[PDB]
Design a protein around this nucleic acid. Structure first.
Ligand code: NI
Lengths: 240, 237, 107, 333, 108
DNA sequence: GACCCAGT
DNA sequence: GGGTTGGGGGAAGCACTGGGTC
């Protein structure tokens, strides 16, 4: 078992949930956004295999390949090491996609996002071969923009790690399907995107106030036999 | 022997209320039962006798908490201190064991601290000359470092001497009074019944405030303050 | 706290009962940050003593009491080791905060 | 132990529907109840039967209909009729659903219809969603009547709102407290006291209601509710429904925390009470632009904010009491 | 440290009443100065009026003013040479002038 | 895609 | 130093594309 761990130090979030007027955002990036960000990196880097007429099937084939090289439906998990905070932004979201209402119809919608300082992303595989190991290592980097086209993410590093059954409490997200013994925190997460299903994941977010602010601290769930160590700070990963 | 007034102690203060009340029992109890029956619990006039006795006996027991004594010594101001609110937590558990329920213990714990100066639960216009404020009384509550040992057994000294039910006292240090005085107020403020938790609690309050004749007079309108102190004509001779 | 006995003098130059209305000194002392303008601003406030002395007598109330020198040195001895703006503003802002009071002593 | 299941739709809508569960179980008793937070699920753990839950709802909706019919297709001026409701189409549609359960809950029959949630209870609603390409028609978010009725009951009693119209335009600010670590009947019932019924101020003298961050202070000023937040932990969520020039849209939506504001007011209104409200009301009415500097200094402990507001307000009119100045330095020290 | 109060007591007799002597010019010039040279000039101008005030107080019934000790002159002299930067010069320029206005019991 | 609405 | 005045009134966001139904 090999886990590809990367670090994304991007200040403000990019994802927006299914919402109008306000644009609610996830506290941690959805797996679908990460799947898209990694899939789009293979096209401009390896265009000799991603031949498509349009973008609609171009995304579909890349997502299908990513799912094929995946152990299960669970795409990828993230670990926050910084206190998340829910910011407030007011953006322009024009509404002119209906059969009418002239051409210029734009008003202000509160498209607010979330701020973090440190974040890890752990992709999971099934001991892939070497000839594509380097390709995926190079593809893990070069993630300049995530979510929408207004915020940029900057990767830091990328390396493979073994579980080796080390003692550490769970830190990355995990689906809430059969895990009950692990203050518990689950929301709609939308691991699987749609292009014309919805699973519930456990997210490691808890609010703790010391004297002034509440932010989002760590819930420290019960220890899981699977975990990975990095830069001294060991974090627990849930593997099916 | 903890004194309750400037020159009057709590001991004779209790008998002053009893000597005011031996005649009030035959005027309000048949009228208080018919309005009490709305809460769900029901009992005869004999149980109402002991209920009103338990309320009158502990109404201002919180006046001995090493705070009132150090204030009323020579000239020290109260600084917005409330002496009787802690008595509420004394009046909550005592009714829990001698009635073996909660629906009648809750109203007692409210009426015991609806007197003197009740707490104002928000909704002010622009001003408050008086000190009916939870924020300023919490500051004076924060200094409550328990109660003296002299009142530990003292509570056994007036309940056994008149009727006698069961000996039981609580042990306030910092927080048992807190999460009770807060819970009673929060439960009394928001319930499906709108006006009952006001009119019935005031109805129970009314016979408890006959203390004016018990203590020294302080206002010139004493004639109108004792209209119900008398009764109708018994006979001709 | 050597503050209650000095804030009432600072309040003498803002109250309506003394109509001179000099906020320049209050603005100078409120925005004092590094080492020096905090001691310079309070000089302007403490200088205008005659003003208040004459103005209280011009209406009938007793002359205002000038703060005692028994605690003025508490600012000089504190500003020395508190050179950084981390905790120096922490009291510089309170000095100007105490200047906006009423202190109704001239009915 | 029953553990009534709560559907997860929106982090704000689920707050309203689940947090409104208590107003019905209180009417039916439900001793020894609790509410375990989940960030958005907010599940109620109570060892009570399901039958009394509908007995709570029938009493709650009787109160709602009594409030609605008292004031005045019929449109009232209540929170659930025209107070926080920015859209006129829901002025009569919403009460019609509320009385509809009178033909469903009284004779012990489950819900079968499904209504459309307005924007007031849940801001993420709308008309133009995005699925793969372009937009659609109508409101795809359709809420069953069971969860639909459970939201208004918690909205009217618990979460407050402030309305400031000024003729054609209209500003509505909605604030609600969301538990994040633990909560009990002591806190959820206390939060009910914050509700402002009929917050129609209008005129021109009361203009201080400009901006949500300034209206929250005025709402909080005249409500000296329980100060348990000094030992507990809670978060304030607020959203606006602007109708400038009959244009229903949301232009302000920020997330803040209420604990520090609780502590600020608790430490301020302790030395005296008569003059503190007068001082803050004077600075709010006169120093309209200056009270923003005072409110902003509260969530970040800004030293210059404690002075700029007073400087800008003293020039117009300020009592400037003595005991309240010592209250600020209690926080400062 | 210690001499500031002593010099401030002397400066207090120039701005207080019961003396018929009000000279704010020098106390203003001492504090809100710009250069180290004028500091000692203002100190001299303030200190010069020692004999004219040392005799009138007893004639008016007030106790005689306590002349600052000559040892404090050494401290105020030896404090200024090594400190030439204007960054922390104004603070000492106004420190001694601050004590001019206080509650000294000049005429009990 | 053309309909709807408010009170000091 | 010894008195007269401390703001004065007026303005303190219009229009502009409303978002839901049906
Ligand atoms: Ni009494």
């Amino acid at each position: 078992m090999d886990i590809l761990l990367v670090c994304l130090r991007f200040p403000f979030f990019s994802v927006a949930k299914r919402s109008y007027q306000v644009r609610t955002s996830f506290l941690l990036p959805p797996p679908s956004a990460l799947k898209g960000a990694l899939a789009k990196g293979l096209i401009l880097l390896k265009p000799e295999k991603y031949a498509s007429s349009s973008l609609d099937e171009a995304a579909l084939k890349a997502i299908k390949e990513i799912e094929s090289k995946l152990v299960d439906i669970k795409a990828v998990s993230v670990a926050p090491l910084s206190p998340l905070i829910r910011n407030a932004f007011l953006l322009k979201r024009l509404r002119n996609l209906e059969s009418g209402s002239n051409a210029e119809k734009s008003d202000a919608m509160r498209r607010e996002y979330t701020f973090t300082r440190e974040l890890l992303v752990a992709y999971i595989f099934k001991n892939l071969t070497q000839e594509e190991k380097n390709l995926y290592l190079k593809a893990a980097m070069l993630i300049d923009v995530i979510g929408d086209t207004e915020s940029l993410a900057t990767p830091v590093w990328a390396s493979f790690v073994k579980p080796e059954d080390k003692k550490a409490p769970l830190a990355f997200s995990a689906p809430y399907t059969e895990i009950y013994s692990l203050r518990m925190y689950i929301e709609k997460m939308r691991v699987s995107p749609e292009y014309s299903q919805e699973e519930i994941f456990y997210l490691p977010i808890e609010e703790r106030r010391y004297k002034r602010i509440v932010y989002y601290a760590r819930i420290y769930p019960p220890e899981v036999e699977k975990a990975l160590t990095v830069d001294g700070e060991v974090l627990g990963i849930w593997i099916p | 022997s903890c004194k309750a007034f400037q020159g009057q102690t709590l001991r004779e203060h209790i008998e002053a209320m009893l000597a005011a009340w031996e005649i009030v029992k035959n005027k309000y109890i048949p009228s208080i039962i018919r309005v009490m029956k709305t809460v769900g619990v029901k009992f005869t006039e004999e149980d109402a006798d002991k209920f009103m006795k338990t309320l009158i006996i502990l109404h201002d027991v919180g006046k001995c908490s090493e705070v009132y004594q150090k204030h009323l010594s020579n000239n020290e101001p109260l600084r917005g201190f409330r002496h009787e609110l802690v008595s509420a937590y004394y009046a909550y558990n005592i009714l829990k064991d001698m009635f073996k329920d909660e629906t009648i213990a809750f109203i007692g714990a409210l009426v015991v601290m609806m007197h003197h100066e009740p707490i104002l639960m928000g909704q002010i216009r622009s001003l408050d000359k008086e000190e009916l404020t939870p924020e300023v009384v919490l500051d004076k509550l924060r200094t409550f470092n328990g109660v003296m040992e002299g009142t530990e057994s003292f509570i056994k000294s007036m309940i056994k001497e008149k009727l006698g039910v069961i000996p039981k006292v609580p042990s306030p240090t910092q927080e048992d009074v807190l999460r009770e005085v807060i819970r009673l107020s929060v439960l009394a403020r928001h319930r499906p019944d709108s006006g009952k938790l006001r009119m019935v609690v005031g109805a129970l309050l009314i016979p408890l405030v006959c203390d004016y004749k018990g203590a020294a007079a302080a206002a010139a309108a004493a004639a109108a303050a004792a209209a119900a102190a008398a009764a109708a004509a018994a006979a001709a001779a | 706290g050597w503050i209650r006995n000095i804030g009432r003098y600072l309040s003498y130059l803002v109250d309506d009962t003394f109509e001179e209305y000099a906020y320049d000194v209050v603005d100078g002392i409120a925005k004092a940050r590094t080492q020096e303008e905090l001691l310079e601003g309070v000089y302007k406030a403490l200088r205008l003593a005659p003003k208040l002395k004459k103005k209280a007598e011009s209406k009938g109330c007793p002359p205002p009491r000038i703060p005692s020198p028994e605690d003025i040195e508490a600012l000089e001895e504190k500003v020395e080791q508190l050179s950084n703006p981390k905790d120096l503003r922490k009291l510089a802002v309170s000095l100007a905060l105490w200047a906006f009071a009423s202190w109704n002593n001239c009915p | 132990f029953n553990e009534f299941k709560t559907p997860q739709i929106d982090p704000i809508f689920d707050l309203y529907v689940a947090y409104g569960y208590v107003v019905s179980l209180i009417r039916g008793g439900a001793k020894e109840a609790t509410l375990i937070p989940h960030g958005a699920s907010y599940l109620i753990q109570t060892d009570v039967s399901n039958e009394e839950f509908r007995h709570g709802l029938v009493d709650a909706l009787s109160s709602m209909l009594s409030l609605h019919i008292a004031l005045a297709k019929l449109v009232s001026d209540a929170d659930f009729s025209a107070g926080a409701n920015i859209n006129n189409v829901y002025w009569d549609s919403v009460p019609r659903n509320l009385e509809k359960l009178m033909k469903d809950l009284e004779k012990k029959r489950s819900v079968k219809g499904t209504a459309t949630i307005p924007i007031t209870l849940m801001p993420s609603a709308g008309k133009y969603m995005l699925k793969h390409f372009g937009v659609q028609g109508g409101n795809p978010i359709k809420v069953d009547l069971l969860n639909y009725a459970l939201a208004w009951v918690g909205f009217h009693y618990y979460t407050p709102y402030i309305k400031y119209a000024k003729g054609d335009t209209t500003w509505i600010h909605i604030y609600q407290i969301a538990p994040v670590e633990e909560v009990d009947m002591i806190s959820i019932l206390s939060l009910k006291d914050l509700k402002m019924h009929l917050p129609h101020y209008y005129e021109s003298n009361l203009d201080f209601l400009i901006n949500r961050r300034l209206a929250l202070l005025y709402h909080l000023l005249h409500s000296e509710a329980l100060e348990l937040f000094t030992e507990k932990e809670f978060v304030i969520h607020s959203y606006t429904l602007e109708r400038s020039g009959n244009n229903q849209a949301i232009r302000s939506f920020e997330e803040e925390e209420i604990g520090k504001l609780m502590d600020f007011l608790w430490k301020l209104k302790r030395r005296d009470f008569y003059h503190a409200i007068k001082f803050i009301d004077d600075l709010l009415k006169k120093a309209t632009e200056g009270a923003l500097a005072l409110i902003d200094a509260i969530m970040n402990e800004r030293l210059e904010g404690f002075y700029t507001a007073l400087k800008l307000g003293k020039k117009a009119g300020v009592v400037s009491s003595r005991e309240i100045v010592a209250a600020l330095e209690d926080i400062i020290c």
